Design a binder for this molecule. Structure first.
Ligand SMILES: CC(C)C[C@H](NC(=O)c1cn(S(=O)(=O)c2cccc3cccnc23)c2ccccc12)C(=O)O
Length: 460
């Protein structure tokens, strides 16, 4: 069938031109990147390793494959070296890709399931040496293909196995388990266990009120990406490995003209999907970078708001940084801004739709911190943006309690004006008036007492 090959040629060229350029750009980008952050650099090395392996598959394996294996009528044009080299390089890359793919699964698992251990015990230098081992291990396990494959004349020349069927069955079965089955088994398990561990963390993190930490939200996106990579790897590589197992077992005697025509379709289809796996690789890079960038932007926003770098804050929000980013303890940037007393940074965030009634672990809102600080302008600002006046923490402490306790008469007058419940008291039973007396802020006590008595007059 002439048409079949013409259709395959078009698809191969399509995967070749964009896949080669696609992965080429990824390497060029990473090489010049000069990333300062550890997480960025750590991931980039793996993406580069995947970019390199998948580029080599498209640059060298595909052209040889297309000319001598798809268009079979051509005699072998690459000589004995080209035959042995083709299968060696092809085998080395399959391994490398599979090992890199599962290497992402252990790194995600470690990050999710051993956060304390991983954070401390992960360095850039550790990753470089680890990846070096993968390529070496792959190259070592690829060497056999230099000895198992060679040129035989059936007068034309064909790049065919030169060893006996028994020896051939072993090496490929070894390669199948080592470079696919084992990796994809581990990849699936580690992902599934990490996915379950993550789900607990999300439920543990978010309760009555704690929002959701940005770092968890990053890992929650992480599993979803690798979930796609494993499902993507299996559908693309299973047919290839299954075809190779068919070839070794379906050896001699039964090799009819008809059986080959069938196997040739399998060969076109199975290899096309391998080149698809190489061609979609740059999407994983884009998705990985998009995620890692969003995480860094969010970290920067929390750092900037605390530091009081108003210029930085604006820059980040302009480039779609998450306004409502909780830290480890559930602190939004508005908390940190209001805490440190950056009226400008507070105004900017609220303008970009910052959650005015966000809660931390202790249940503190931004207003609680502004009342503690005593910054009247921010308190006024927050209340204008619809901040809850009678919001209470775990202990039952409210803004009025904090203000009165620490002696901010202007804040106390402001809070009462916005419908603050003077009567409301904490778990210990103390009202603001009781706390004001306890601290001895007599000027404030008089201000509160009059309000309570006014409420009694209003009742009759
Ligand atoms: C198990 C692997 C180490 C070898 C396998 N190669 C083959 O199955 C092929 C081996 N040849 S061939 O050039 O040796 C060949 C050429 C022509 C007729 C053949 C009949 C039976 C077996 N091979 C024949 C192919 C021709 C077209 C498509 C595929 C092949 C592969 O590349 O995956």
């Amino acid at each position: 069938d002439i048409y079949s090959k013409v259709l395959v040629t078009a698809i191969y060229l399509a995967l070749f031109v964009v896949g080669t350029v696609g992965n080429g750009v990824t390497l060029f980008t990473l090489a010049r990147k000069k990333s300062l952050q550890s997480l960025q650099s750590r991931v980039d090395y793996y993406l580069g390793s995947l970019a390199l392996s998948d580029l080599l598959i498209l640059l060298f394996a595909l052209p040889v494959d297309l000319y001598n294996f798809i268009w079979v009528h051509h005699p072998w044009a690459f000589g004995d070296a080209g035959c042995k080299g083709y299968y060696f390089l092809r085998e080395a890359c399959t391994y490398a890709t599979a090992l890199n793919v599962v290497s992402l699964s252990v790194e995600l698992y470690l990050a999710i399931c051993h956060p304390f251990k991983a954070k401390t015990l992960m360095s850039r230098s550790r990753t470089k040496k680890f990846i070096s081992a993968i390529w070496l291990a792959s190259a070592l396990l690829a060497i056999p293909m230099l000895f198992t494959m060679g040129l035989q004349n059936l007068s034309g020349l064909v790049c065919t196995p030169i060893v006996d069927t028994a020896t051939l069955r072993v090496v490929i079965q070894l390669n199948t388990f080592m470079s696919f089955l084992f990796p994809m088994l581990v990849a699936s398990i580690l992902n599934t266990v990490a996915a379950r561990r993550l789900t607990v963390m999300v439920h543990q993190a978010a309760f009555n009120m704690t929002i959701e930490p940005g770092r968890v939200q990053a890992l929650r996106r992480g599993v979803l990406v690798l979930r796609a990579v494993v499902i993507a790897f299996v559908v693309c590589w299973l047919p290839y490995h299954v075809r190779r197992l068919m070839f070794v077992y379906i050896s001699d005697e039964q090799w009819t003209t008809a059986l080959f025509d069938f196997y040739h379709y399998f060969y076109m289809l199975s290899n096309a999907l391998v080149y698809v796996s190489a061609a979609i690789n740059p999407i994983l890079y884009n998705l990985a970078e998009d995620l890692v960038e969003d995480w860094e932007k969010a970290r920067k926003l929390l750092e900037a708001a605390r530091k009081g770098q108003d210029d930085e804050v604006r820059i980040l929000l302009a480039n779609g940084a998450d306004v409502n980013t909780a830290d480890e303890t559930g602190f939004t940037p508005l908390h940190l801004a209001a805490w440190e007393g950056h009226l400008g940074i507070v105004e900017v965030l609220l303008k970009n739709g910052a959650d005015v009634n966000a809660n931390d672990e202790r249940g503190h809102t931004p207003l609680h911190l502004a009342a503690y600080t005593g910054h009247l302008e921010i308190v006024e600002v927050l209340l204008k943006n619809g901040a809850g006046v009678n919001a209470t923490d775990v202990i039952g402490t409210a803004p009025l309690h904090l203000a009165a306790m620490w002696g901010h008469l202007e804040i106390v007058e402001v809070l009462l004006k916005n419908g603050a419940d003077v009567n409301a008291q904490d778990k210990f039973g103390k009202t603001p008036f009781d706390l004001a007396i306890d601290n001895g802020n007599e000027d404030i006590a008089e201000v509160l007492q009059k309000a309570a008595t006014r409420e009694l007059e209003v009742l009759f």
